[PDB]
Write an enzyme that holds these catalytic residues in place. Sequence first.
Site, PDB file in Angstrom:
ATOM      1  N   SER A 155      34.290 -29.291 -13.571  1.00 11.30           N
ATOM      2  CA  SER A 155      33.817 -28.305 -14.570  1.00 11.30           C
ATOM      3  C   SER A 155      34.221 -28.695 -15.981  1.00 11.30           C
ATOM      4  O   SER A 155      33.756 -28.023 -16.889  1.00 11.30           O
ATOM      5  CB  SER A 155      34.375 -26.942 -14.305  1.00 11.30           C
ATOM      6  OG  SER A 155      33.791 -26.331 -13.176  1.00 11.30           O
ATOM      7  N   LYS A 207      31.347 -29.003 -18.403  1.00  8.88           N
ATOM      8  CA  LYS A 207      30.697 -27.823 -19.027  1.00  8.88           C
ATOM      9  C   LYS A 207      30.888 -27.932 -20.527  1.00  8.88           C
ATOM     10  O   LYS A 207      30.040 -27.394 -21.261  1.00  8.88           O
ATOM     11  CB  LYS A 207      31.244 -26.518 -18.460  1.00  8.88           C
ATOM     12  CG  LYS A 207      30.791 -26.312 -17.018  1.00  8.88           C
ATOM     13  CD  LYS A 207      31.475 -25.168 -16.321  1.00  8.88           C
ATOM     14  CE  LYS A 207      31.077 -25.137 -14.854  1.00  8.88           C
ATOM     15  NZ  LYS A 207      31.724 -24.006 -14.176  1.00  8.88           N
ATOM     16  N   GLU A 243      25.324 -28.094 -10.510  1.00  6.19           N
ATOM     17  CA  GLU A 243      26.358 -27.386  -9.735  1.00  6.19           C
ATOM     18  C   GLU A 243      25.728 -26.917  -8.428  1.00  6.19           C
ATOM     19  O   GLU A 243      24.631 -26.459  -8.459  1.00  6.19           O
ATOM     20  CB  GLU A 243      26.795 -26.117 -10.455  1.00  6.19           C
ATOM     21  CG  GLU A 243      27.538 -26.405 -11.738  1.00  6.19           C
ATOM     22  CD  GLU A 243      28.954 -26.899 -11.556  1.00  6.19           C
ATOM     23  OE1 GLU A 243      29.565 -27.240 -12.565  1.00  6.19           O
ATOM     24  OE2 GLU A 243      29.398 -26.913 -10.493  1.00  6.19           O
ATOM     25  N   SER A 264      37.884 -28.261 -11.204  1.00  5.74           N
ATOM     26  CA  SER A 264      38.378 -28.345  -9.823  1.00  5.74           C
ATOM     27  C   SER A 264      37.246 -28.850  -8.942  1.00  5.74           C
ATOM     28  O   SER A 264      36.041 -28.538  -9.216  1.00  5.74           O
ATOM     29  CB  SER A 264      38.907 -26.971  -9.359  1.00  5.74           C
ATOM     30  OG  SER A 264      39.318 -27.035  -8.008  1.00  5.74           O
TER      31      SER A 264
HETATM   32  C1  LIG Z   1      34.749 -26.358 -12.199  1.00  4.50           C
HETATM   33  O1  LIG Z   1      35.266 -27.375 -11.848  1.00  4.50           O
HETATM   34  C2  LIG Z   1      34.218 -25.420 -11.093  1.00  4.50           C
HETATM   35  C3  LIG Z   1      34.091 -24.117 -11.320  1.00  4.50           C
HETATM   36  N1  LIG Z   1      33.649 -23.265 -10.267  1.00  4.50           N
HETATM   37  C4  LIG Z   1      34.194 -23.378  -8.900  1.00  4.50           C
HETATM   38  C5  LIG Z   1      35.476 -22.556  -8.823  1.00  4.50           C
HETATM   39  O2  LIG Z   1      36.300 -22.746  -9.649  1.00  4.50           O
HETATM   40  C6  LIG Z   1      35.753 -21.491  -7.752  1.00  4.50           C
HETATM   41  C7  LIG Z   1      35.165 -21.813  -6.375  1.00  4.50           C
HETATM   42  O3  LIG Z   1      35.202 -20.647  -5.569  1.00  4.50           O
END
Ligand SMILES: *C(=O)/C=C/NCC(=O)CCO
Lengths: 260, 260
Positions: free
Chosen positions: B43, B46, B139, B210
């Site tokens: 992420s 972003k 995503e 993550s």
């Molecule tokens: C960024 O790397 C991702 C963001 N969204 C996923 C989450 O952080 C939560 C998954 O339940």
Amino acid sequence: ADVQQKLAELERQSGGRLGVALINTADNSQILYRADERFPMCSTSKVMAAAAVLKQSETQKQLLNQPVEIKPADLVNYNPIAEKHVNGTMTLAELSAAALQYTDNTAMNKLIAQLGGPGGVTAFARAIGDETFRLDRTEPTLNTAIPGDPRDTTTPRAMAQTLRQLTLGHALGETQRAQLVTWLKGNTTGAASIRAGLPASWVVGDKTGSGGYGTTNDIAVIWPKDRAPLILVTYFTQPQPKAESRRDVLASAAKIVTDG
Amino acid sequence: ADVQQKLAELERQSGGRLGVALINTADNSQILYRADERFPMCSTSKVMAAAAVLKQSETQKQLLNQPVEIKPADLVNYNPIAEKHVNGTMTLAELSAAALQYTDNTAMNKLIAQLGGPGGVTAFARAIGDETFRLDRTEPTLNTAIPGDPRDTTTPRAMAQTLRQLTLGHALGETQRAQLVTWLKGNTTGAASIRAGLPASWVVGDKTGSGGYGTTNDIAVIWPKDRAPLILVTYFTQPQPKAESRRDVLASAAKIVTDG
Ligand SMILES: *C(=O)/C=C/NCC(=O)CCO
Ligand SMILES: *C(=O)/C=C/NCC(=O)CCO
């Protein structure tokens, strides 16, 4: 997995004193640990001050738009937003958001002054049924967190009950309740505390606190994935004046009381 | 030297692969560890997507206020803001804020689609002089983080230089640079990551990430107490597909590279 045993095992390895109150709104069940002992609130008190100003805004039409002067002599020890506006102004909405989301201590002093001093924050607590909360001093001295000092304290039970009424109940008007929940969900300081003990899919709005004696606090409304909301208060304080923060203890306490 | 020993020790004891790039804007000095190796951005990509839409808004002056339809079918795996607006609309500013400050994946997909797909994000990187960044997927598959896979990767050095140009230099117009910095400073997800390794008085804006293989990332612009701003990228990934997140490794890396 006996939750009371697990919280005691956490506390015994923690080097401090842990206070927990969980309210599960699915069934109004509660998990309590030292929930009737008094802890220093530190910056978690900013929720009561912001809420009392929201309550004022139900009768003073344009209150959150009202500009408030910030002067050099107003700056205290942690002013990440207010220092940008010295010899200028912030609105009461901006001071509420700065206090809750950025834990700005100058912003909290302006909320306290808007309520007539620390006692005006206490008076609002009493008006919404909280007989335990007490705010006695301004920033930054409300964070001294000296063991045994009743100033600027509450209990986990009382703070959980109050946070439920403010965010999910009818202590505020619906517009003001929504604004309080929007502000808590926009907190910047919470990811290592209660939230760190919860699954990645669960949504948190929270207010942290920190102060002397390694005091490390968090109060949260939690929207678990596919469950009714939770209220969770985790307070923690240590015996040495210069103890380090222990946000990891708060995360551990949150995991223990939500695992079941 | 000692910094290199400390980072190698952190990496070895963590079991994973750590990438660090720090730029000190006081003097353009850098601290680097695996800074030319590729890591899955997750992420942290972003920021490039939201910046690309800010760049479009420099010429399409009403673009940030454009409503974008949110359909039930658009929801992916973590959509804390977009799920409240399904069967309605969000503006591109709202989607940018949701992507950056709440890590909403549905909001990132709308930014990617506004830019004509992952290649539009890469095209913006190239336009601002980043020849390393690549976005290949939407995503949530951009987060698979498979070892050896060059898709959806960059290097710490390239991302630190880009984040400097976006937040402190002139990759964006002044209003758009300020808007990106306001968004990053309002991040809700970062307090366990770079921010946890820094003194409490320092001001941070950051974006976490993550993914698979225990991938745990953070990119930050830092305004230290009484010092010129820093840029810090910390990327971390692990050998086991289902490894747990390790935000403490990023906090540890930040403390090591800012202590001296
Ligand atoms: C960024 O790397 C991702 C963001 N969204 C996923 C989450 O952080 C939560 C998954 O339940
Ligand atoms: C809340 O408990 C206090 C918040 N702001 C003060 C600080 O963050 C002090 C850091 O040195």
